[PDB]
Amino acid sequence: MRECISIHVGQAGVQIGNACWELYCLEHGIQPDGQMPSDKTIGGGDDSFNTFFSETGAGKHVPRAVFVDLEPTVIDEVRTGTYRQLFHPEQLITGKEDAANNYARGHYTIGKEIIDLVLDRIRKLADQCTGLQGFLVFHSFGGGTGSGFTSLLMERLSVDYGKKSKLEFSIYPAPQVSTAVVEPYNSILTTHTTLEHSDCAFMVDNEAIYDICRRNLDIERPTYTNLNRLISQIVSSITASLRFDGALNVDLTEFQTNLVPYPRIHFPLATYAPVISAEKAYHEQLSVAEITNACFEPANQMVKCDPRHGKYMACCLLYRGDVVPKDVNAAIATIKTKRSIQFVDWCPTGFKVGINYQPPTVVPGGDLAKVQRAVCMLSNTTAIAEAWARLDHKFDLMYAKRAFVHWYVGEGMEEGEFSEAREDMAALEKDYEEVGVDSV
Amino acid sequence: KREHEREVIQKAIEENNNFIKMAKEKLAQKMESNKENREAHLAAMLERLQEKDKHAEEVRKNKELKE
Amino acid sequence: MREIVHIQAGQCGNQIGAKFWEVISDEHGIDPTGSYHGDSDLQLERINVYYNEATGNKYVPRAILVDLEPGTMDSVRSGPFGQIFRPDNFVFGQSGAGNNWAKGHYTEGAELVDSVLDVVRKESESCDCLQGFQLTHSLGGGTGSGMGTLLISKIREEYPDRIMNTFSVMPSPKVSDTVVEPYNATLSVHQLVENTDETYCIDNEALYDICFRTLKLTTPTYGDLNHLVSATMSGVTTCLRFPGQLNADLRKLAVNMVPFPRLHFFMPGFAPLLTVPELTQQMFDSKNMMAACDPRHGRYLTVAAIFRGRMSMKEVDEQMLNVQNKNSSYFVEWIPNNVKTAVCDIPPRGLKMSATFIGNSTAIQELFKRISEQFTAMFRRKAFLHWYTGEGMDEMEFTEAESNMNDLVSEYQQYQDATAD
Ligand SMILES: Nc1nc2c(ncn2[C@@H]2O[C@H](COP(=O)(O)OP(=O)(O)OP(=O)(O)O)[C@@H](O)[C@H]2O)c(=O)[nH]1
Ligand SMILES: Nc1nc2c(ncn2[C@@H]2O[C@H](COP(=O)(O)OP(=O)(O)OP(=O)(O)O)[C@@H](O)[C@H]2O)c(=O)[nH]1
Ligand SMILES: COc1ccc(C=C2c3ccccc3C(=O)c3ccccc32)cc1O
Ligand SMILES: [Ca+2]
Ligand SMILES: [Mg+2]
Ligand SMILES: [Mg+2]
Structure with a gap:
């Protein structure tokens, strides 16, 4: 059991959802029609990938997910897309009129007309869970739906599911790809409203991702497609412990114990490596020490800030691929004696480590090089x-x-x-x- | 000790229910206040347009009363 | 989908209205019969925004043609793409307004307005999700000015939660010798500031100067002026008509362009009249503004710019950043990131690449000051004031319209002088 339900709200949430679930399917060997040959238990199972996928008697593996947007054109592309067979039609919910980059319309005027229908469809998923763990909510800060409707949903979810865990993947606005001048308003309003209802939120700075796509992948003018394929890798790394098994595998909830010292201090800084093109990765193997040291290069962070001018309250390393504890420990010992890593005095300085032996996957026609080992650092920094x-x-x-x-x-x-x-x-x-x- | 154990879990239930309760009420309050406001804004708008009709009637009336 | 209901009132409104439908019908690749003969699917992605799909794949403009005189109505029906318009949507009176605002707003138009609303209502009721209306008219005449502003108030009564956009043509002695125009304008502006969400200030003074000085066309015809208007109107509706990052939504434009409800008067611009750096410098140049105003005499509250054609998106981003930096003094600092750029892969007709500009500048006050000056010159003498009181108006309604427009000017001045600290 330990099922997890994903909720994708607004354009950003939905399109990132497309990237994430496509990536999941490739990691688990699931086909676009939902069939999974390697899965011998037909119609059900208690495997690790079942936390994210339910199973029909016909052998189809269905994402435990709901897509919601107050306008149909984005989700319509899912309904007619490559992975349209993957989702039941009821999982894809759309209105006719968006929030017009207005938090009020997303939370009140337009949102209230569809909120009950959404909760009902979410309920249908939860009733299929034998031991629901929590929710993962994908959304932007800047959009009217991503901000307004998300906050409404989070409020309603706390009522209908009490203290059941709710995690966020939030898109922090950047001028290079921003769509509205009022995104700061929408950002502050949703953050305030959601703060009491979220247990842990992973912010993704679009400018940070924009720069990484330009710098590391040599993409002159990154598209949402470029950004989302990178974001999905970070999301995959974070959810890998839930979707796979392993001796050295550490559950996300265990990292969460370390990452949240107080309820309001629940915004971890994500850093990912290696991000490298196929051209540069050729005849170039990035070792454990190299990708680990890269986690302390601020240019690789999901959010633009300087941890070197702040204090740490937790440091978690989520490895995947060809990695063993010996090399990790050696890499950490080196880093500690060369980097600007200072902890607050109330917290122990030990790094928490997790390793999933399942190697990194890339989507066909992508820009990311397929590497043998990757790492995602989750730190709680004042920065x-x-x-x-x-x-x-x-x-x-x-x-x-x-x-x-x-x-x-x-x-x-x-x-x-x-x-x-x-x-x-x-x-x-x-x-x-x-x-x-x-x-x- | 058994008594303390009961009080702890009861407190946990109480705090959880209190959070659900307050969240339910705080939201119902917001949607109500928002419904009132938006209506009051649309009502005022129509009233100003209502005055434009009344004015136009007074203008058309003023014309025929100058002949 | 998201339907827009088009309305064109008076002579000027129907002229530019007809031209608007000619140009976009070509871009969307549909002939005056209403049949599609294009090559790209992108032409039909958001066709429903302006067109109704009839039997046998017949695309009909969701447009309503209005005038207090049947003359222009025949011109449209005879002119190109005259067979594409819906016959029942032709609503015409018999008595013109005679360039009298009172006639259009209170007398003659008030009698024809209901039959117009019946057509509006019929179109609207068939929309999947109506988003609003767009009006083409002049403020100098009588019908399009007086009755146009009447329709706006009436439409806003039945559709108060919809967007009301207007393409208003401003009067100029350089083009029209009619003397009473500054009255009709001031009276119209008095209405537009209260009841419209977005008003594109098409200024004949600007249109004249462009044809004459830039295009080197002495004694410019209305066809010349409208060629500018058509290219402008085509540009500012590109994102409303084509697939892009941001979709066709009148409300989203208003939300991001209008920081204060009354300050919703945009000065559009167009280029050329090339390379990306050239386009960008021109579209921000005063010579390319369709409103007779110098942007360097005020500050930009917000700006929307649409580049069209195949070009380097990296370059467009760099040059737009370059202008904001080199001209930072002309953008208010208390609105971060107030300049947004859009790009459409499909260029206009005849041009390999173009750039359309939509600016909310405090320099727009120069335009309202011009009208106010010409207005007070007529109103101090009470010249031709009998044509208005004759329809039952009062001297106050002239005074109220004056001071309200004076407030609009000073309000634009307030936020021009405002600072972050
Ligand atoms: N990383 C990433 N960001 C996106 C994507 N799509 C939109 N955004 C960001 O989201 C913000 C705008 O919010 P949206 O999600 O597009 O709007 P919305 O949630 O659909 O709400 P509406 O205003 O009603 O449309 C902007 O700052 C965009 O940069 C995406 O696919 N990937
Ligand atoms: N740019 C442009 N302006 C025009 C055109 N036709 C008329 N105008 C302007 O419109 C103003 C007068 O308004 P009109 O539209 O002609 O008159 P109307 O709206 O039909 O009102 P009435 O004639 O009184 O019934 C004048 O200042 C003209 O300069 C046109 O085709 N293009
Ligand atoms: C000033 O800030 C903004 C201003 C306008 C918009 C949105 C728009 C816009 C929104 C919806 C439909 C059409 C448009 C456009 O045709 C347009 C063209 C170029 C750039 C932006 C815009 C978005 C913003 O963030
Ligand atoms: Ca199974
Ligand atoms: Mg949206
Ligand atoms: Mg005329």
């Missing part, structure tokens, strides 16, 4: 608060003049919700500052 600081500043510039606020007020919201949301963020920045101060 992530820099991402809040940048967003909150852009929020302040516009709100001082009440720019664009009338679009929100027009949809039923009040300025009190803006000030309430911004104050919670200021408290959050203060929280990250306090945890870094030495004990008395």
Whole structure:
């Protein structure tokens, strides 16, 4: 059991979902029609990949997932896409009118018209679980649906499922690919509203991913397709412990114990390696020591910030592929005596390690080189608060003049919700500052 | 000791239910306040357009009363 | 889908309206019979936005043709793509407005408006999900100006949660010798600021200067001015009509272009009148603005730009970054990332590549100051004021429209002078 239900909200959530589930299928040897030859238990099973896939009597392996968007054109591409047979039609839910980059429309005006239907379809998935573990919610900060509807959903999920774990994969906005000027507003509102309802959230800075695609894969002008195929690798690394087995395999919940020292401090910094093109990877083997040291290069982070100017509260290394503890320990010992790694005084300095022997997979026609071993570092650093600081500043510039606020007020919201949301963020920045101060 | 054990798990249940309860009410309050506001905004808009019709009637009336 | 309902009122409205439908019908690859004869599927991806699909794959414009005189109606029906328009959507009176705003708004138009609304209602009720309306008209005349603003108020009554966009043609003595125009404009502006979500300020003063000084066309015809308007209207609706990163949504444009409800008057621009750096410098140049205003006499609140044709997207990003940096003083700092770029692979007709500009600049006040100046010159003498009171109007409604437009100017000035600190 230990099933996990994925919920993909808005364009970003959906399209990242397409990348993730395509990648999952290739890792598990599942076909586009849902058939899995290697799986001999037909109609069911308690294998590790069953945490993400249910099984029909006809041998089809179905993603434990719901796709939701208040506009049909993105999900329509799923309905007619390569993996259309993979999902039951009821798993793909669409309205007719999006949130127009407006949090209010996503949370209230438009969202309320579909929220009950969504919860019902989510319930149908959960009833098929023999031991539901929690939810994974994919969404953007900037979109009206990704922000507004997600926060509404998270609120409703806490009511219908109590304290059942809810994890986020959140797309932090970047001007190179941003779609709205009001994304800072939507970002602060969703973060405030969701904060009490999320147990752990992995932020993905689009600018960080944009730079990595340009720098490491030599893509002149990365598309969402370029970004999403990279994101899915990070997501895969994080969920690998749930979808596979192994002696040295460490469950994500165990890392979570270390990563969240206080409820509000639940935003881990992800760093992935190696990101390299086929051209450069040829006749070039990146060892355990090399990919591990790369985790402490800020240019490889999912969020733009400087951990070297902050303090660590946890450090987790999630390896996959040809990796053994001996080489890991050697690599860590070297890194500790050359890198700027400083912990807060209330936390032990030991790195927590997990290894999944299943090697990295790549999607056909992708840009990422197929390597024998990869690593994803999950750290809890005060430096992530820099991402809040940048967003909150852009929020302040516009709100001082009440720019664009009338679009929100027009949809039923009040300025009190803006000030309430911004104050919670200021408290959050203060929280990250306090945890870094030495004990008395 | 057995008594303490009961009190702990009861407290856990109480806090969990209290969280669910407050979350349920806080949300119902927000959607209600939002429904009121949005309606009040659309109602005012129509009232201003309603005044434009009343004005136009007074204009057309003012014309024939100058002949 | 997401349908837009087109409306064209008065002479000017129907002229540019007809031209708009000619140009995009070509781009979407449909003939004046309503049949598709294109090569790319991208032409029909978002065709439903402006067209109704009838029997036998017959694409009919979702357009409503209005005028208080039947003259222009025959011109459209006889002109190219006159056989594509829906016959029942032709709504015509018999008595013109005679360039009288009061007639169009209170008297003559108020009698014809209901039959128009019946056609609006019939079109709207057949939409999967109506997103709003777009109006083409002038503010200098009587019908398109007076009755156009009447329709807006009436449509907004039955569709208050829909977007109301307008392509308003501003009057200029350089083109029209009619004397009472600054009255009809001020009275129209008084309505547009209250009841429209997005207004594209098409300025004849600008259109004239472009044909004359840039295109080297002394004594420019309306066909010349409209060729500019058509290319402009085609550009600012490209993303509404073609597949892209961001889809066709009037509301999303309004949300990101309008920081304050009253300040929704855009000055469009077009280029050329090449390489990517050239296009970018031109489209931001004052000479290429369809509104007679210098952007360097104010600051940009927001800007939307559409490049069309096959070109380097890396280069477009770099050059757009370059302009914002080199001209940072002309963009308000209290709105981060207020310039957004879109790219359509399909170029217009005749050009290998072009660039359309949509700016929300505080420099637009120059246009409203021009009208206000010409207005107060007429109103101090009460010249031709009897043509308006004759229909039952009051001197106050002239005063209110004046001061309301004066407020709009000062409000644009307020946010031009505003600072981050
Ligand atoms: N990484 C990544 N980011 C995306 C993708 N699609 C959209 N985004 C980001 O999401 C933000 C806008 O939110 P969207 O998800 O597109 O909008 P939405 O959730 O559908 O809500 P609506 O406004 O109603 O459309 C922008 O900052 C985009 O950069 C994607 O496929 N991958
Ligand atoms: N750019 C452009 N402007 C036009 C065109 N036709 C008329 N105008 C302008 O429109 C203004 C007058 O409004 P019209 O549209 O002609 O008049 P109307 O809307 O039919 O109202 P009435 O004639 O009084 O019934 C003048 O200032 C003209 O310069 C045109 O084809 N192109
Ligand atoms: C100023 O900020 C913005 C302004 C406008 C938009 C959206 C749009 C827009 C949105 C929906 C439909 C059409 C358009 C466009 O045709 C357009 C063309 C180029 C760039 C942006 C835009 C998005 C923004 O973030
Ligand atoms: Ca099985
Ligand atoms: Mg969307
Ligand atoms: Mg005329």
